[PDB]
Amino acid sequence: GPVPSDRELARSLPGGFRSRHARVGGVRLHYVSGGHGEPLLLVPGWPQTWWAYRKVMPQLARRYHVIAVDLRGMGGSDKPAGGYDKKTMAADLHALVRGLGHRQVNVAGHDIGSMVAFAFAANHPEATRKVALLDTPHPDQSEYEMRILCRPGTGTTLWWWAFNQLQALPEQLMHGRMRHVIDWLYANSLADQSLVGDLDRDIYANAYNSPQAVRAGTRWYQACHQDITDQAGYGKLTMPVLGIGGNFTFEDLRNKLTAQATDVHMVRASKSVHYLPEEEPDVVAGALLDFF
Amino acid sequence: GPVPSDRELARSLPGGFRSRHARVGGVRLHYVSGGHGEPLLLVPGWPQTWWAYRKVMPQLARRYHVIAVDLRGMGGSDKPAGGYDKKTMAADLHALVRGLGHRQVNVAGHDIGSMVAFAFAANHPEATRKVALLDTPHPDQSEYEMRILCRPGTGTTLWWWAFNQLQALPEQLMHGRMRHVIDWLYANSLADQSLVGDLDRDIYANAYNSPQAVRAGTRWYQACHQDITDQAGYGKLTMPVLGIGGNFTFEDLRNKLTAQATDVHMVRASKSVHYLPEEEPDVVAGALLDFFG
């Protein structure tokens, strides 16, 4: 294999992490676990894998039994025909956590995995002790306001939200070429490119390089409409909510969370654009320790 | 594998088209010309070439001297580092046409070539007899209202307006794979996929498949900010204007042209989505003969 196995990757981590599999509801999920304490669930997003949490999992494993998943269609997990709406994927994680003997877990999600961490606290509040959302708010009616074009100074367009809606074309252009996508996303994100080295980038690209791997990733975005339907319907969250926002998304994230939760805390990752676990593992790790 | 050359392609048409070149402002343009009559300039868009006009050139050639170009950055034309705003590309065509001894020309364009057509009239009204615009209006403030996401029942998103803004990534993903891009666009426009055959699709892919060819293509889209600015300085067009719109862009095309010009005629291509000269050749060709008269 072009990159090491998740098995080898897990063991490279300080300390005592182990790569594993579990079948739930017909879908085999991959995850990496270790550390001792109350359970803490880490959910990554696109186009990443559990390996996105490599920088913080050690410090977090000191206080919690860390469980870093690959969502369905992500990396080492099964890549089924459907079920990529955020609700269904939170259900998978529900079954997974209970199947491992926990009635309640701390949750933390990033990007797509943040939408999933929100749909987890929304649909299974009993099984959610505290919830942390890194950067990315759950889809709502405001996704329809995203513009194709930004006036030159204004910001950055999330072009992949449009591109990932397409059938066939994404896998046709991106299969075997995800390293370039990953390189583009980091060139418009990181203050320092060496924050995510060549090998780590290749680990992500290998997870996504096959045509079925690219297609599954897109399913996450194609379920945007559904996710938006489902969001209107959710009651407010009662359990403690943590929102960590970068410079790009902090106040949008604060606006939405305070409108969707009664007990909210906000932290600003002042040196990060999007990839908080990789960009500021220091701040993220500490924030989640304090919060939990 | 390889496709026919532009000289071969031009000679395959009825009747009398020759494949040519002219150096203007140091930039070398490829074009195909033929026929007899008043000069008719024909400008294509992304990701096509002059060959997009194959179905309508023979009819038009019976009445006009047809000059069907490849824009700066397109097909057989040079691909310099800059100059991809519509005003500069219009100047190119203005230098070309005048250098061929034509003080005034009829002009029709499509897609990106429609923006160029419009820019040509806006910057050189003395050199523009009349102008026709197929489907695509010139960039203005409304481009900043286009949405990344449409609701399920709603019209189609122009995802490539966003994608082609990018540096480096588009070459990296599309080089060698342009046939797929072209198939997606036709899958989402043609009523019947045989309206544009395999060989014609490969003719476009080949022109666009190199990293530099893709990069050039995106330059047309990246110049949108500049084009929008330039448009805010343009006075209304007073020469005769013809807008030919697809079935789902007609209303938008009309409202924008009647706001930007004073003498407008509209034709609806009501079996077409976007590639008008390929989807309704006889409607296009007819609308142009009647309007250039």
| DSSP per-residue codes, B52-65 | GGTTTHHHHHTTEE
Q: How far apart are the first and last CA of chain B?
A: 42
Quote the number of domains for chain A.
1
Amino acid, single-letter form, for residue B239: M
Nearest CA in chain A to B150: A144
Supply the range of the domain harboring residue B260.
1-293
Beta carbons of A143 and B161 less than 8 Å apart? no
- CA distance linking residue B236 with residue B188, whole number of Å: 33
Interface with chain A: mutation pick from B148, B156, B163, highest number of A CBs within 10 Å: B148
Q: How far is CA B207 from CA B6, B177, B202, in A?
A: 11, 12, 9
Beta bridge partners of A133: A109, A243
**Interhelix angle for B224-232 vs B112-123, to 10°?**
30
Q: Are A67 and A43 in contact (CB under 8 A)?
A: no
- CA distance linking residue A244 with residue A246, whole number of Å: 7
Tokens of A231: 């969001």
From A39, A52, A54, select the one nearest A107 (Cα to Cα): A39
Instruction: Quickly count: other Cβ atoms within 10 Å of residue A214's Cβ.
Output: 22
Q: Are B45 and B113 in contact (CB under 8 A)?
A: yes
Contacts of B145 in chain A (CB under 8 A): 147
- CA distance linking residue A158 with residue B21, whole number of Å: 40
Nearest CA in chain B to A226: B152
Q: Are A263 and A128 in contact (CB under 8 A)?
A: no
The answer for residues whose C-beta is within 8 angstroms of residue A157's C-beta and 6 or more apart is A146, A147, A148, A149, A150, B148, B162, B165
Q: For B112, which DSSP code?
A: H
Q: For B147, which DSSP code?
A: B
* Experimental method, per PDB record: X-ray
Contacts of A172 in chain B (CB under 8 A): 177, 180
Nearest CA in chain A to B172: A180
After which residue numbers is chain B interrupted with C–N beyond 2.5 angstroms? none
Nearest CA in chain B to A149: B144
Interface with chain A: mutation pick from B142, B161, B173, B231, highest number of A CBs within 10 Å: B173
- CA distance linking residue A150 with residue A152, whole number of Å: 6
Work out the minimum CA distance from B207 to partner chain A, whole angstroms: 17
- CA distance linking residue B22 with residue A224, whole number of Å: 50
- CA distance linking residue B41 with residue B132, whole number of Å: 10
Q: By 3-state DSSP, what share of chain B in percent is helix, strand and coil, each rounded to 5? A: 45, 20, 35
